[PDB]
């Protein structure tokens, strides 16, 4: 009765499904919202008002986070939550800036903590977690924004840390990134480079061997923001290029078929500022070797509305799974717009 990957439900294109807008209707102040779905329910996690008021809350998806509906979990500024198969797991970090401390909340009782190593800032995905076979996988980093912030993978089971994974290769900057089960054997991520490169460092995780390799994506569509013009960086794939300063988390979600894997992406429509979302797709191939452009597949949010932090996640169906992608919008309380894969034809 655990959690295992399966095949995705049939479909061709994303369609709008829902939105939660507490600004319209005692709403809280929430930021960095992320959603993980268990076998029976989904919770809309968030962070309320770094300071000592930063708490991790959760309301059932579909419900606006009121004061009486929101259950507090922990005092942290960087959250993560998923379902190992039987009950909920949570991760959060707080403390002093230079000496931060990670926390685990499993079932109802607090279990374990982990300390910092590079002694600058310790932080996690700020999104959901991916757990397979009772071994739940997370990513944490420690270092500087303008320096080196090397990342580590965590292997937690029943609320207890088991193993740490050290990536190999170009590992000089990685932070703030969603992940998804590409397959049973290989698990991917899509991350953010703040200073060096205006691209997304692509991480490959193997659950069987517990090894990580980080390579930059060779495609022409530079998904990060701010970005230069597409296809303006010459040379090999690992060339950082110009205007690599700055970054933002980007959506990323899989599409599991019988004998083929498709990949959805997203980015900002604007080149420099964060005004509006758009969705761009690629079918199959090697991310580390293919420089072909992503196929445009719709306008996600119009340019008159702000497209901030986005996430990627899955909702569990009876016999399959649905890949759904969501976006946060700000105004400083946040709304969410949640889009799922559904039907066929063309996106409106």
């Amino acid at each position: 009765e655990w959690t295992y990957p399966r095949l995705s439900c049939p479909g061709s294109t994303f369609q709008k499904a829902l939105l939660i807008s507490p600004h319209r209707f005692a709403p809280l102040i929430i930021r960095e919202p992320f959603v993980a779905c268990g076998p029976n329910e989904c919770k809309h996690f968030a962070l309320t008002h770094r300071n000592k008021l930063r708490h991790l809350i959760s309301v059932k998806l579909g419900k606006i986070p009121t004061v009486e509906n929101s259950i507090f979990h922990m005092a942290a500024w960087s959250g993560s939550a998923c379902h190992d198969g039987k009950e909920w797991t949570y991760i959060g970090v707080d403390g002093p800036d230079n000496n931060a401390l990670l926390k685990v909340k499993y079932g109802e009782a607090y279990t374990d903590t982990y300390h910092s190593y590079a002694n600058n800032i310790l932080r996690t995905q700020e999104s959901a977690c991916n757990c397979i076979g009772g071994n739940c996988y997370l990513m944490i980093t420690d270092g500087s924004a303008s320096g080196v912030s090397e990342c580590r993978f965590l292997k937690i089971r029943e609320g207890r840390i088991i193993k740490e994974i050290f990536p190999t290769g170009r590992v000089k900057h990685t932070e703030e990134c969603t992940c998804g089960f590409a397959s049973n054997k290989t698990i991917e991520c899509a991350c953010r480079d703040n200073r060096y490169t205006a691209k997304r460092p692509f991480v490959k995780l193997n659950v069987e061997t517990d090894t990580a390799e980080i390579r930059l994506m060779c495609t022409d569509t530079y998904l990060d923001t701010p970005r230069p013009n597409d296809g303006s960086i010459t040379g090999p794939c690992e060339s950082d290029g110009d205007k690599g300063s700055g970054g933002i988390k980007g959506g990323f979600v899989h599409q599991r078929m019988k004998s083929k894997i498709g990949r959805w992406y997203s980015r900002t429509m604007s080149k420099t500022e964060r005004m509006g979302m758009g969705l761009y797709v690629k079918y199959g191939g090697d991310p580390w070797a293919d420089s072909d452009a992503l196929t445009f597949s719709g306008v996600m949010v119009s340019m008159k509305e702000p497209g901030w932090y986005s996430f990627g996640f899955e909702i569990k169906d009876k016999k399959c799974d649905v890949p759904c992608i969501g976006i946060e919008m700000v105004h400083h309380s946040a709304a969410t717009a949640i889009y799922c894969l559904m039907g066929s034809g063309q996106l409106l």
Partner: nanobody, 101 residues
Framework: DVQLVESGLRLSCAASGDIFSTHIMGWYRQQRELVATIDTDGSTNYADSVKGRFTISRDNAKNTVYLQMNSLRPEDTAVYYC??????????????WGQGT
């Protein structure tokens, strides 16, 4: 590191590194009151007292922005500071203060 230098009639606010595409530039004169700002998308904002008299032009290639005066008034005599504040809290770089002219 990265610093801002002012040499300005023509003004030049030269910067090092790659802060020209992520930080919001401004001009402050000397109380401390707004003069001129630009963004990284081309949008230009100016103070109410200085409508239609300031022209701002940037150069992404070599990391220096320009400012030009027309019909100078005696009331404009001040020391002008070019700064590089970051509009986003998610960006972990601070504002840098130039020496000014």
């Amino acid at each position: 590191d990265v610093q801002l230098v002012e040499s300005g009639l023509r003004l030049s606010c030269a910067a090092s590194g790659d802060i020209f595409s992520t930080h919001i530039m401004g001009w402050y004169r000397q109380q401390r009151e707004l003069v001129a700002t630009i963004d990284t998308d081309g949008s230009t904002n100016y103070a109410d007292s200085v409508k239609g008299r300031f022209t701002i032009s940037r150069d992404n290639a070599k990391n220096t922005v320009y400012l030009q005066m027309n019909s100078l008034r005696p009331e404009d005599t001040a020391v002008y500071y070019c700064n590089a504040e970051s509009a986003y809290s998610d960006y972990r770089l601070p504002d840098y203060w130039g020496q000014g002219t």
